[PDB]
């Protein structure tokens, strides 16, 4: 009389097959790409001309001197 | 040819170190200007540093 077959609980679990979780599609893509590229060229002409009024600073202690 | 003699030699040379020379290095030239410019003439307008010694 000790036989299986339970009276209810029952799902099931699912035969479905999704994940859409996108995940900023469509033109919102190449653009955080674009203005954080010329980001890091407006970083320059800040520090490379910088760096170059350095430079002629540099050559100019050698000019100064040497008579 | 001839050299000048061991006299007109052994004059008082600065004796300082490089990173002393070149702490100033800026001021120094900047104010004196009358020996040094005459003195690149003497050297590069006419050559043979044995006339330009003085």
Redesign the interface.
Same mark, same amino acid.
């Given at each position: 009389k000790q036989d299986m077959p339970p009276v209810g609980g029952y799902g099931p679990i699912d035969y479905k097959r999704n994940l859409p979780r996108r995940g900023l599609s469509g033109y919102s893509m190449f653009a955080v790409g674009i203005g954080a590229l010329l980001f890091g060229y407006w970083s320059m002409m800040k520090w490379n001309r910088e760096r170059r009024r350095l430079q002629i600073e540099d050559f100019? &202690?050698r000019i &100064?001197?040497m008579? | 040819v001839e050299l000048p003699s061991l006299e007109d030699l052994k004059v008082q040379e600065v004796k300082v170190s490089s990173s002393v020379? @070149?702490a100033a +290095?800026?001021h120094?030239? +900047?104010q004196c200007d009358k020996?040094? @410019?005459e003195?690149?003439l003497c050297r590069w307008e006419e050559k043979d540093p044995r006339r330009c010694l003085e």
């Open positions: 100019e &202690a &100064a001197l008579p | 020379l @070149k +290095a800026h120094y030239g +900047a020996p040094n @410019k003195f690149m």
